[PDB]
Symmetry: C3
Subunit: 271 residues, 3 copies
């Protein structure tokens, strides 16, 4: 597959936060979505603009120790410093010993490994996390992708212990990337929608026995994803997603999946 | 593909509890088991007999925002109010985008979404929860179904952290619905028995790679279920089920799968 | 299968620990690895050398109530006593009614059920746990097996919260058995390697939709395992494994999978 390159910056934002961005002064929490096809190699031209050591570490993908982004493997970045990180991917295939080598495809994530502690406790806390999707040949591609990160008792490090709203139209193929970080377990729930507990979050067919769920227990550095048909069999509406741990939802760990009719309207709701 | 109609009532119960029932004065915790086939529509004539707003919200099934049972969608019920909730279910099928639409089938649950907080924290704590099973055409039906709800540090809101006992005979096909609620994670474990981590809790055949487990980590609003052949390869006995979080078992979060020999006896 | 017999000892160890061993004065935490093929029977002649009641209890495998290792089923062992526990396993196959019977194969574990509490809370905390592997005919066998137990905030009851290092050469087939015990949930993570969320931790082939993961939430009495090709697509190095709950990693719940080049060296 293709050899690609991107630039990534770790920036200190306002309210003491830390973000990854594709451009100087455009950092977000979560970080930009990185999307690769199995076989693709990505060279990340990383610059740490901060006054503290920072790194880039990735789950799931192939990398050498020289791209671990750890102190252990000397692959974190001094303040103002630069480093090229290399992420490789592979397709599934038959090994010489006759076994099936699992591909890179899945819902993954990248995060800092050296801000605050040697495990990135400070960096993760402040917002140095973002989503990676690795696709298999033939995977169904969505109309939109939305990333929801349960980071301690926050969603996407938003204030007032509350999460973002995502808009779609009835019938849209909407993809969710669901990442968890920090100290606590959570349960991710979405009203009016459900997905498969498997690689793609979609049943392959009637010979896929994967449990169909609307609620999933997640812990720190868990990642999964799924695609739904917005409003399928349920209609347009304000469709709550929330942590289902009762004190978490009560704290305001809640967001809206706003599913509009094709005339742009939505049944009346009271946020 | 039948249209069904039931009545459901929310009621205050003894010892500061609340429950759902099919008739006034007959509320239980957990609530009544609702069983549907994929394609069935259920109209629930729900009456809130209580002095606080209350709702019905279901996991997994198809419903419009007018049946959300939330403050957000104004679809909860005033004190002494009545409201018809509609739950729909669908069969799986091939979409016009060539993907496979997951059917409604599975182990699900319903609970209040407005007692105490706008997430039903009070209602759930006090007993407003019950199990829902949606069956696929050709699913294997059990000899009996038993519901185990880990609600905070209780089983089915019973006193003294203790779980109920369920009786079976060796060779019985026994279904468990396992639902978790409240604040805490748990691990559900059963002695002498095991199940598949998949939709039915039963391996479909040799092509089913699902992990076979006797221990499952669960969090609030998780629901799974399974069927076992009682005593299969292990024989009659008092087969403990317990949370496997050590302080949880130690405080009494334990019950018995009492599997009788064909003559009716349990060794011990 | 085959009928196998072993001796097992429960012994007190230095620092108030308790271990199982295959020989007196060779007890380890975790206990010895027990490996069976589906259909095998294992008779364990268990001697409790300690001054308190102790038991042997197994997850996943077939056993009668007389081998429960519980007070409930009067199958624990008096101080200094001996008891023969029997574990059976079965291959999968169709029942007479056409349903698929799952099979014993999996990553399992054995532990004490009577030290400290009637759920073995003290036995487990002190180190009375070990791994069981039940293999299916045609299962891929590894070059080595390493056991990692998250016991409360310890790995394998080691002091100062640290984990063991495990050594391999690039290309080795390395099996990990991952068991959790005690009070807390955890997330197991390995740098530079990944596995399938299914029975074997390896995809059956291109029809297996199991999620591929490098991070798994686990709770008390959870067992899973997997095999990796050491350094596959990533090369030689010090490959960290760690609990991913940030306070757990920060307090030292970390270890190294040391993958050497064929020439015996590792990158700095
Ligand atoms: Cu790490
Ligand atoms: Cu939460
Ligand atoms: Cu990580
Ligand atoms: Cu809700
Ligand atoms: Cu529990
Ligand atoms: Cu809910
Ligand atoms: Cu037990
Ligand atoms: Cu941990
Ligand atoms: Cu146990």
């Amino acid at each position: 597959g293709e050899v690609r390159r991107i630039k990534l910056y770790a920036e200190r934002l306002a309210d003491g936060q830390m973000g990854y961005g594709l451009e100087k002064g455009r950092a977000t929490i979560p970080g930009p979505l990185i999307e690769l096809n199995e076989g693709d190699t990505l060279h990340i031209e990383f610059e740490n603009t901060m006054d503290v050591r920072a790194s880039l570490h990735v789950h799931g993908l192939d990398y050498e120790v020289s791209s671990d982004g750890t102190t252990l493997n000397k692959s974190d970045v001094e303040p103002g410093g630069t480093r090229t990180y290399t992420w490789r991917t592979h397709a599934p295939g038959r090994r010489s010993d006759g076994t099936w080598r699992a591909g890179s495809a899945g819902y993954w994530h990248y995060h800092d490994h050296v801000v605050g502690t040697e495990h990135g406790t400070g960096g993760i806390r402040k917002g140095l996390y973002g989503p990676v999707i690795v696709r298999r040949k033939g995977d169904v591609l969505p109309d939109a992708t939305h990333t929801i990160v349960f980071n301690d008792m926050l969603i996407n490090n938003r204030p007032a212990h509350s999460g973002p709203n995502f808009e779609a139209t009835v019938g849209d193929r909407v993809e969710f990337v669901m990442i968890t970080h920090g100290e606590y377990y959570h349960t991710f729930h979405m009203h009016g929608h459900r997905w498969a507990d498997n690689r793609t979050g979609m049943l392959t067919g009637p010979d896929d026995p994967s449990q169909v769920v609307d609620n999933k227990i997640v812990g720190p550095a868990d990642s999964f994803g799924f695609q739904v048909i917005a409003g399928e069999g349920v209609g347009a509406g304000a469709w709550m997603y929330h942590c289902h741990v009762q004190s978490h939802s009560d704290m305001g760990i809640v967001g809206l999946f706003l599913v509009k009719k094709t005339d742009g309207t939505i049944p009346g709701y009271e946020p």
